[PDB]
Each structure stands twice: as structure tokens, then as C-alpha cells.
Design a binder for this molecule. Structure first.
Ligand SMILES: COC(=O)Nc1nc2ccc(Sc3nnc4ccc(-c5ccc(F)cc5)nn34)cc2[nH]1
Length: 245
């Protein structure tokens, strides 16, 4: 009742909100629950909770920092942007860092994908779509079979997210139907290496998709390996969109 005063800012879909600061605003005891804990999830590569509006009474309103450049998927798809291999790998280093943070908190995302990451005005990537701002506006083999999610299944998802980055936002398995993805994978298949994807980064993808969950890299390992691959590029290789996809 009184231990929530550090989160609450008093006296559905999302809207453009004001306060000068530009925010995005998402339309009661359990509300102060995640409000306080989500407030504790502060990291440069994770979407912050600025606060909650309950007065008087509110929707209540979940208020979040506005992200100048929107979601990562639409950003890389935009034909007027000219990303390099370095930029894209950079985005998929920032996501790994955000996830490393979430995993350290033993928090499982369950729906990691490029559409659920945001980019701000400094081009910092924020892992989003969790906590109160979790909604429907990539799954590991075992998850499709058990409906259980772990950080190890987040890692599988991250591998698919890296594929998205390097294809500039192409739909994964476009000629495949959702009902039979498990059958598809169990035939011995994975997503193809993107034309502009470095061999080592594809090896990283394949590791994220290991059939044994415990053998997939931790996000700490992924941050380490991808920081290395990233450091080798200087931004001379431009990534173009694939005609078929
Ligand atoms: C030029 O893009 C913007 O509108 N800027 C923007 N800043 C935001 C700041 C917070 C939010 S709410 C939120 N919290 N987790 C998620 C995960 C995904 C999306 C999402 C992205 C794309 C899209 F089409 C529809 C939904 N939103 N979202 C939305 C925002 N949109």
C-alpha cells in the first residue's frame, strides 16, 4: 500500500503519452506487484518501466519510455535504412546483453523476437514485450513438445532473432506452416545461412539451436562470442534485402 510509492506516478492498446518527456502509455493490488518488480528491471538493453498511473482511477496506465525508432524488425526492413554487417551484429549483441541481464534475474522471456525489441534515438536496443507491457500486438523443439519455457528456450529464440537481423527482417521458414514446424525440424532442418551472415555468426545460430537444451550457450557466452565477431568488422559491408524474402 505504501511500499509502491517509488513506482506509482499518480497526481489494451498503447498510446502516445506526454510527460517535458515523450513517453508511450499502455491502457490493483496485483498491479502494484509487477509494478515494483518490473521497476527493478533496469538495464541499458531492456525497456524500462517509467511508472504506473492509477489515478483516479486510471486504466491503469502503464507508462514506458518512447522509442524513437520503433521495433527492431520494422527498422531493419525499412528500405531507406542502410545497415552494415557491423550494425546488425551490433544489434544482436545488444539483445544478448539485455537477455543476459534478464537471465541473471532468472526471468524467462518466452517471446523473444525482433518485433519485440525496440530501438531508441541513440540506436540502443531495448528488449521489450515483458512484464505489464506484455501482449500480442521462434520456439525451441522441446517447447513445442512440452509447452514449457526456460532461458535455454529463450536462447533458441535468440538464434532465430539473429537470423532475422541478418536477413533484415525476413519471415523465418516462409514456405513452412506453423502446425508442422516440429515435424519440419525433426526431419533434420534449420534456417539457412543468410547471404550477408558471417560464417562464425551462423555457427553461433546453430549452437543456439542445439537439440539438447543444456548444450546451448548461455547468454553470457553469447555476449562474449558475439562481442568478438562484432569487433572484427569496420562497417564496410552493406547488407541488402533478399529478393526472395
Ligand atoms: C516508430 O515506432 C514507435 O511508434 N515508437 C514506439 N515507442 C514505444 C515504446 C513502448 C511501446 S509498448 C511495448 N512494450 N513492449 C512492446 C513490444 C513490442 C511493441 C510493438 C512494436 C511495434 C509495433 F508495430 C507494435 C507493437 N510494443 N511494445 C511501443 C512503442 N512504439
Amino acid at each position: 500500500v505504501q511500499a509502491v510509492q517509488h513506482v506509482v506516478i499518480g497526481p489494451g492498446c498503447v498510446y502516445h503519452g506526454t510527460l517535458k518527456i515523450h513517453c508511450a502509455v499502455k491502457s490493483v493490488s496485483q498491479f502494484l506487484t509487477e509494478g515494483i518488480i518490473m521497476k527493478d528491471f533496469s538495464h541499458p538493453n531492456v525497456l524500462s518501466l517509467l511508472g504506473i498511473c492509477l489515478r483516479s482511477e486510471g486504466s491503469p496506465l502503464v507508462v514506458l519510455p518512447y522509442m524513437k525508432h520503433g521495433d527492431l524488425r520494422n527498422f531493419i526492413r525499412n528500405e531507406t535504412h542502410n545497415p552494415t554487417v557491423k550494425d546488425l551484429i551490433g544489434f544482436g549483441l545488444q539483445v544478448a546483453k539485455g537477455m543476459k541481464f534478464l537471465a541473471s534475474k532468472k526471468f524467462v522471456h518466452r517471446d523473444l523476437a525482433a518485433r519485440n525489441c525496440m530501438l531508441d534515438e541513440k540506436f540502443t536496443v531495448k528488449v521489450a514485450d515483458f512484464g505489464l507491457a506484455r501482449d500480442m500486438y521462434w520456439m525451441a523443439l522441446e517447447s513445442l513438445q512440452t509447452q514449457k519455457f526456460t532461458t535455454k528456450s529463450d536462447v533458441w529464440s535468440f538464434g532465430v532473432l539473429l537470423w532475422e537481423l541478418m536477413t533484415r527482417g525476413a519471415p523465418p521458414y516462409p514456405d513452412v506452416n506453423t502446425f508442422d514446424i516440429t515435424v519440419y525440424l525433426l526431419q533434420g532442418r534449420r534456417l539457412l545461412q543468410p547471404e550477408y551472415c558471417p560464417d562464425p555468426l551462423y555457427e553461433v545460430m546453430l549452437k543456439c539451436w542445439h537439440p539438447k537444451a543444456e548444450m546451448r550457450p548461455s547468454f553470457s557466452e553469447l555476449v562474449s562470442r558475439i562481442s568478438a565477431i562484432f569487433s572484427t568488422f569496420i562497417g564496410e559491408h552493406y547488407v541488402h534485402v533478399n529478393a526472395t524474402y
